[PDB]
Amino acid sequence: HHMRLKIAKESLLNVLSHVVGAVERRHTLNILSNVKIQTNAQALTITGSDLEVELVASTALSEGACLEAGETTVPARKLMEICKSLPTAALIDLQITEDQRCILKSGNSRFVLGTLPAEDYPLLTTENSQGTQVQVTQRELKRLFEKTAFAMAVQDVRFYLTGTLLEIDENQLRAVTTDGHRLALCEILASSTSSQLVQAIVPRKAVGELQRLLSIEDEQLTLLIGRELLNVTINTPSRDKEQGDITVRFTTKLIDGKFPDYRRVIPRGGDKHVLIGHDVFKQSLQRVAILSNEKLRGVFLNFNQDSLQLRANNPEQDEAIEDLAIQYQSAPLEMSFNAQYLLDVLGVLDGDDVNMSMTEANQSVLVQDPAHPDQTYVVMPM
Amino acid sequence: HMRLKIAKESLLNVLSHVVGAVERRHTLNILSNVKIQTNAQALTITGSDLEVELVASTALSEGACLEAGETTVPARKLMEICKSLPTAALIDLQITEDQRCILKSGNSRFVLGTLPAEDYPLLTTENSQGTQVQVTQRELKRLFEKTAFAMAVQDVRFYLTGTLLEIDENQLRAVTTDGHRLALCEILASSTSSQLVQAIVPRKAVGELQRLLSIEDEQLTLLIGRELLNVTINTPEQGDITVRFTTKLIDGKFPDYRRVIPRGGDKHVLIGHDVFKQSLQRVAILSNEKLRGVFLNFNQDSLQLRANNPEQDEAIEDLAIQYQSAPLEMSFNAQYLLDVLGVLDGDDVNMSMTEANQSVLVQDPAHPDQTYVVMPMR
Numbered sequence A: 001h002h003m004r005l006k007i008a009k010e011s012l013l014n015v016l017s018h019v020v021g022a023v024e025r026r027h028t029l030n031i032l033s034n035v036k037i038q039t040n041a042q043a044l045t046i047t048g049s050d051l052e053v054e055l056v057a058s059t060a061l062s063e064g065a066c067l068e069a070g071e072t073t074v075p076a077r078k079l080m081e082i083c084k085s086l087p088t089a090a091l092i093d094l095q096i097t098e099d100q101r102c103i104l105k106s107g108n109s110r111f112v113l114g115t116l117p118a119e120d121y122p123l124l125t126t127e128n129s130q131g132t133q134v135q136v137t138q139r140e141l142k143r144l145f146e147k148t149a150f151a152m153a154v155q156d157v158r159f160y161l162t163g164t165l166l167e168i169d170e171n172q173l174r175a176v177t178t179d180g181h182r183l184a185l186c187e188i189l190a191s192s193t194s195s196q197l198v199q200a201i202v203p204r205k206a207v208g209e210l211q212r213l214l215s216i217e218d219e220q221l222t223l224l225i226g227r228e229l230l231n232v233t234i235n236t237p238s239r240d241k242e243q244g245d246i247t248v249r250f251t252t253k254l255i256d257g258k259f260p261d262y263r264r265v266i267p268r269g270g271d272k273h274v275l276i277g278h279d280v281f282k283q284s285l286q287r288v289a290i291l292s293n294e295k296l297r298g299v300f301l302n303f304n305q306d307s308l309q310l311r312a313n314n315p316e317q318d319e320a321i322e323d324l325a326i327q328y329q330s331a332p333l334e335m336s337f338n339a340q341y342l343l344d345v346l347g348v349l350d351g352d353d354v355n356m357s358m359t360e361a362n363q364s365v366l367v368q369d370p371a372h373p374d375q376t377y378v379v380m381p382m
Numbered sequence B: 001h002m003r004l005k006i007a008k009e010s011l012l013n014v015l016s017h018v019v020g021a022v023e024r025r026h027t028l029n030i031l032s033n034v035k036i037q038t039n040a041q042a043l044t045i046t047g048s049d050l051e052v053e054l055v056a057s058t059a060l061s062e063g064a065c066l067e068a069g070e071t072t073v074p075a076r077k078l079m080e081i082c083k084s085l086p087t088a089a090l091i092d093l094q095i096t097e098d099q100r101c102i103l104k105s106g107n108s109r110f111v112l113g114t115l116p117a118e119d120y121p122l123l124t125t126e127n128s129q130g131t132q133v134q135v136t137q138r139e140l141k142r143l144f145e146k147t148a149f150a151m152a153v154q155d156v157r158f159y160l161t162g163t164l165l166e167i168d169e170n171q172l173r174a175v176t177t178d179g180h181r182l183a184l185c186e187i188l189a190s191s192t193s194s195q196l197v198q199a200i201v202p203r204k205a206v207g208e209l210q211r212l213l214s215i216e217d218e219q220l221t222l223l224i225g226r227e228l229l230n231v232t233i234n235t236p237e238q239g240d241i242t243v244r245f246t247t248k249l250i251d252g253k254f255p256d257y258r259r260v261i262p263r264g265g266d267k268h269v270l271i272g273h274d275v276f277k278q279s280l281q282r283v284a285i286l287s288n289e290k291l292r293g294v295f296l297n298f299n300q301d302s303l304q305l306r307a308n309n310p311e312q313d314e315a316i317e318d319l320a321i322q323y324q325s326a327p328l329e330m331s332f333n334a335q336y337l338l339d340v341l342g343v344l345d346g347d348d349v350n351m352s353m354t355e356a357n358q359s360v361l362v363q364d365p366a367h368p369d370q371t372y373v374v375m376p377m378r
Helices: A009-017 A076-085 A138-146 A204-213 A278-289 A339-348 B008-018 B075-084 B137-150 B203-212 B273-284 B334-342
Strands: A004-008 A034-039 A043-049 A053-060 A066-068 A070-075 A091-096 A101-106 A109-114 A132-137 A163-168 A172-178 A182-189 A198-203 A220-225 A229-236 A246-253 A272-277 A298-304 A307-313 A319-324 A333-338 A353-358 A365-368 A375-379 B003-007 B033-038 B042-048 B052-059 B069-074 B090-095 B100-105 B108-113 B131-136 B162-167 B171-177 B181-188 B198-202 B219-224 B228-235 B241-248 B267-272 B293-299 B302-308 B314-319 B328-333 B348-353 B360-364 B367-374
Touching: A004 A009, A009 A043, A009 A053, A009 A076, A009 A091, A034 A076, A053 A204, A070 A076, A070 A109, A076 A109, A076 B273, A132 A138, A138 A172, A138 A182, A138 A204, A138 A220, A163 A204, A182 A339, A198 A204, A198 A246, A204 A229, A204 A246, A272 A278, A278 A298, A278 A307, A278 A319, A278 A339, A278 A353, A278 B075, A278 B108, A333 A339, A339 A375, B003 B008, B008 B042, B008 B052, B008 B075, B008 B090, B008 B241, B033 B075, B052 B203, B069 B075, B069 B108, B075 B108, B131 B137, B137 B162, B137 B171, B137 B181, B137 B203, B137 B219, B137 B334, B162 B203, B181 B334, B198 B203, B198 B241, B203 B228, B203 B241, B267 B273, B273 B293, B273 B302, B273 B314, B273 B334, B273 B348, B293 B334, B328 B334, B334 B367
Parallel strands: none
Antiparallel strands: A004 A066, A004 A091, A034 A043, A034 A070, A043 A053, A053 A246, A091 A101, A101 A109, A109 B314, A132 A220, A163 A172, A163 A198, A172 A182, A182 A375, A220 A229, A229 A246, A272 A353, A298 A307, A298 A333, A307 A319, A319 B108, A353 A365, A365 A375, B003 B090, B033 B042, B033 B069, B042 B052, B052 B241, B090 B100, B100 B108, B131 B219, B162 B171, B162 B198, B171 B181, B181 B367, B219 B228, B228 B241, B267 B348, B293 B302, B293 B328, B302 B314, B348 B360, B360 B367
């Protein structure tokens, strides 16, 4: 019949917090701006999606929480705001009427929102089958994205550039990202059945959502990677007085393309190798950059034996020059890089030293951390 | 030429005070630079946009000043360059004949383009003068916090975009208005001259002044003239820095604010501050996004807040208040009432009104020095 539910502010908001990151402020399909809420005596399920990424969060309800079972759709952003505005430990009474109106009462406050029918809410149907399953911990998966999120393109004509390639091969999961000017790669240990490689290009919004959901803990996760979709169920531990655990089901349409062979892009020529202290390199580039071109941000790195010179100048003829101590005994080379790209990779590296492998000025550069061989970064020249 | 050897922090502290006045782009290009003067005893840096002028001075250690001179250096760049250096670094400034400023710290060398110190324009002049006012930094700063929000952001009536400093016999007063609301605050301040004087201080001037002033009880002498307002502030550990602040006043006639405030309110309501702020915020969620309009209905012993939007969503909240006067219904911009609440530090809030189509006086019993007026909608 018609849904009615009485629950604590924190309980409702907590489940909602996990799903409303997927909801778009305005969407071509009007109903997707709303969250779908379904309740019965034992559990409350909330769904949020934009048809590319879908999140379903559910929790075990309290004894008297569901007065009347039912399902409906409520404007997600408003409801979330309404809940946060209530005082701590408040109790909300939700009522859905025959005319499509959702009535929220808490304390002396009375709110009324417009609802839309729950069966009009679109779900990501799984028309394919026989997907690949990968076993990986949350930390390992979260790490893959943290070390490669930056090089992804924000918006572009070519779609696969905007996503993260997730590849499974020989008991190791890999994440690869590129915008055409740089590349990031991270590899971790995962368990899977397939002997052959499987590839999934995960859209940028989905990657962000997953990053928020994952934790540092080593809880095992099972990823189902199909030709058209990627599925993962995560159990978030909700620790509150008498609060049930929240289970979130993540579904995302994979980007339809074929990612470029990343291995061919990675330089293994390695003629010249340099090792530099991470702090010195980071600090020096920031200094030199101040006088580089404002949008372009290009600086010149001149490599000489055991000494790196950073040089930058702008249109106003201002110049910055600094000398750094580096572990380099090979031939001389001067290159120019978009500073920010170097600074971006440095943010990703947790080790004390930084190593670069170079061949020629025109050619690309390979950057890494000796301590962590799992991460590999490439930066092209100007 | 000018040469100077100064610690990173010493140079940085001086620049930080003055950089707020500098503009990213200015019609006169030189004002994007900061003017630097040095001699054996002191360092003086000036930042200005020709509406507000800041001059920061410090006592230089002997021998820091290798050569005395003056010049102008791009302020934003200099500021960033100094921040990028390591802690406790030593900077060597050098000005060459070809207008290049060479700055060397550690292993890094920086070169900026300079412009003639001669060209740099100054607001002040020898015959500037001014009627003195004695006021504490804490009190002056307080005056600005209380009335700053109600100034108009942009308006043809240029006077509206500034705070009016008015001096009464025993106190200094700050008044701001944008047409839809008004803020007023009074603080005791000594007056040597005992003549009413009005100064309309520009919005940027007020912001700069708020940043520089501190919450301590240090007396200040404020010079107020027909065209400028001047005050020397010694800032409250990096030695000691004195800043000379000068501003071009808005040459206009501020409206008679006393007419605008209404003392005739018959209908009076007292509401808990926290309750009112929370309630208003809750109901405002479901109000028009651009307009932010909420309805306040006054009934015996209760306050009803109601808001709706185009999607016909509705929020209603009831507040228990002691009101036994005739029922009144009014429409207000939620932001205007919330803004007033932000500057009220007291536990209760007093509202006095006459009719639905007329203004409302808002006050905090604990602090009678502050008075606010909000004009209703429709």
